[PDB]
Ligand binder design. Structure first.
Ligand SMILES: Nc1ccn([C@H]2C[C@H](O)[C@@H](COP(=O)(O)OP(=O)(O)OP(=O)(O)O)O2)c(=O)n1
Ligand SMILES: [Ca+2]
Ligand SMILES: [Ca+2]
Ligand SMILES: [Cl-]
Ligand SMILES: [Cl-]
Ligand SMILES: [Cl-]
Ligand SMILES: [Cl-]
Ligand code: NA
Ligand code: NA
Length: 326
DNA sequence: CCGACGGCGCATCAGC
DNA sequence: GCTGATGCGC
DNA sequence: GTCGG
């Protein structure tokens, strides 16, 4: 909360550039500025002070001078007062509706939750489920429930094959007291970088969790990534638990460390870590870290035995999951 | 109309 | 069907 | 919008 005023300001501007201006690179620049400011251990006193930080330029500095002097920003005042910009921004909050669909919908006079409910014929399956659970999906998950959820998934996976190993990642793994959704990393010795010895490895797991009624709906589903919905069982004369988003990712067993690094996040941390790589002369994805060369073609994968190894290649020193909340 | 800016899975469309 | 783009998602 | 070639 040290500089919460300023970081809240820049996050709002970011959300506007992404969802309204359709300017993904201005969105990324605002989020980077908010992030570097959030890890700064002093209270900012002027724009000039701010401009010293990497990712803060002439324009963001003038905006900080205005906020510090007046407690608000005229630019954001007007944006808030623009009903068209507000509707576009709101619609993107539904799972499956992005900037293009939101602007299309608003150009067509659809701009409220009610408007979507009576125009479902304009929505695809993904968007309909996002609508169904919109309230449920706005809510966060107390760590106590994340624990119950973890116990169910691990027990059912084990009943399918004792050789599976399931790991809960994302903000949960970063130690957060509440999470936005559940992310499950899955491995099995049958699936490696070399060969796919077992068919429907992901399918057998999804199908058992559906059989005991933990997973309730599917958003998308392929050979390695499941995106859907789940719910804990409740007691009689007891309010139902909210439905929750769940993501499952089957990663080759020999690529577990790059996988868990990617799946732990946070997102801006990943963006910032992969950017440092590029100027260190490497490129990191969820499968490998590689060195690059003169034609823009990446080299062979480098050896990896832990998460620390990846930090090493780029001369960052290790950071516990709880310190990756950039 | 300096141009890059992190990287990719799944679903769908344009022009073959 | 393909390749290459787009759109939304992690 | 920021930075750097
Ligand atoms: N643009 C993104 C979004 C996500 N991720 C990775 C890092 C995230 O931690 C992980 C899961 O994404 P989530 O949206 O579930 O984000 P979190 O778990 O970190 O936060 P929370 O679910 O609490 O909102 O995927 C990423 O690399 N790039
Ligand atoms: Ca999550
Ligand atoms: Ca997630
Ligand atoms: Cl942009
Ligand atoms: Cl303001
Ligand atoms: Cl690895
Ligand atoms: Cl790869
Ligand atoms: Na700067
Ligand atoms: Na959305």
């Amino acid at each position: 909360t040290l500089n919460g005023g300023i970081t809240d300001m820049l996050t709002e501007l970011a959300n506007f550039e992404k969802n309204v201006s359709q300017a993904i690179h201005k969105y990324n620049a605002y989020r980077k500025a908010a992030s570097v400011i959030a890890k700064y251990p002093h209270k900012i006193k002027s724009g000039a002070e701010a401009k010293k930080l990497p990712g803060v330029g002439t324009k963001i500095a003038e905006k900080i001078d205005e906020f510090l002097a007046t407690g608000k920003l005229r630019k954001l005042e007007k944006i808030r007062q623009d009903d068209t910009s507000s509707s576009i921004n709101f619609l993107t909050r539904v799972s499956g509706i992005g900037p293009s669909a939101a602007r299309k919908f608003v150009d067509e006079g659809i701009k409220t939750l009610e408007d979507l409910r009576k125009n479902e014929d304009k929505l695809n399956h993904h968007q309909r489920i996002g609508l169904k659970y919109f309230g449920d999906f706005e809510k966060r998950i107390p760590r106590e429930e994340m624990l119950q959820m973890q116990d169910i998934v691990l027990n059912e996976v084990k009943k399918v094959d004792s050789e599976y190993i399931a790991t809960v990642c994302g903000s949960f793994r970063r130690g957060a007291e509440s999470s936005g959704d559940m992310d499950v990393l899955l491995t099995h010795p049958s699936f490696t970088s070399e060969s796919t010895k077992q068919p429907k490895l992901l399918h057998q797991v999804v199908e058992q969790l559906q059989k005991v009624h933990f997973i309730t709906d599917t958003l998308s589903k392929g050979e390695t990534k499941f995106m859907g919905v789940c719910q804990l069982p409740s007691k009689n004369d007891e309010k139902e638990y909210p439905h929750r988003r769940i993501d499952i990712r089957l990663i080759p067993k020999d690529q577990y460390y790059c996988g868990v690094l990617y799946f732990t996040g946070s997102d801006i941390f990943n963006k910032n870590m992969r950017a440092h790589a590029l100027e260190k002369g490497f490129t990191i994805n969820e499968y490998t870290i590689r060195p690059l060369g003169v034609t823009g073609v990446a080299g062979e994968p480098l050896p990896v035995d832990s998460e620390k190894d990846i930090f090493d290649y780029i001369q960052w020193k290790y950071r516990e999951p709880k310190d990756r909340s950039e």
